[PDB]
């Protein structure tokens, strides 16, 4: 009815998942259109105080952190957004699980911060409308040191190991979960990557990654359980054909 790696393949139950402009996609940087209109991203309100706490929950498909009101993200003139939630996609032991790929390369994991256009008061109004939702996406890679910002979330996974369980976590700097380079990114129009696969979503994928320790990546991929009694692993959708869409780059590809 809705699960990674099997049946139903999604269009049988959610026809919009067979649309022509779906996400995620494979990014080929030498083929992206360099677009100097794409200026550095602007975030405000992402540095949260310790109280009030946020909600962290295992929904069977990911771990999702609900963000409080007041987080603003600007992609450019006329493209202002309010953050709603973030969640992650990952693989398993020795197997990467990012959703986007770069030249076919899959990264260990990926963070998605989902936002609602300021044109709309409610998510339901914005579904399927061009630009109504925007997602910021960054790849997570292995580095040598523990990532202190991620540890605030990863240390709480054990208590929400069971599908459907929830907890509360202190406010933290949400921007410290994202790359520091706000100037280099790719952007394209796609869809939600889970059913109902609604189109019109503006995807922004940072070029720079974030680094977590090997232990932290194991904690992320190995702690949670999903539907039935499977481990919550490999929770990524396969990449989708561009079907003529152009991916834009905010920076000149190096090579
Ligand atoms: Zn996602």
Residue numbers in the entry: 140 to 394
Tell me what the authors wrote about this structure, in their words:
In preparation for future neutron protein crystallo­graphic studies of experimental inhibitors binding to CA IX, we expressed unlabelled CA IX (H/H CA IXSV) and performed H/D exchange (H/D CA IXSV) on preformed crystals. The other H/D and D/D crystals were both in the ‘small’ P21 unit cell, the same as the first one we determined from ESRF data. The small P21 monoclinic unit cell contained two CA IXSV chains (one per asymmetric unit) with a volume of 123 080 Å3. In addition, there is only one CA IXSV per asymmetric unit, which is useful when using neutrons for protein crystallography. The overall active-site arrangement of solvent and amino-acid residues appears to be largely unaffected, with an r.m.s.d. variation for all atoms when superimposing all four structures onto each other of less than 1 Å. We conducted a careful OMIT map analysis of the structures and found that in all four structures there are one of two ions bound to the zinc ion that come from the crystallization conditions: either acetate or formate. Furthermore, comparing specific residues that compose the active site shows that the overall architecture is maintained between H/H, H/D and D/D CA IXSV.
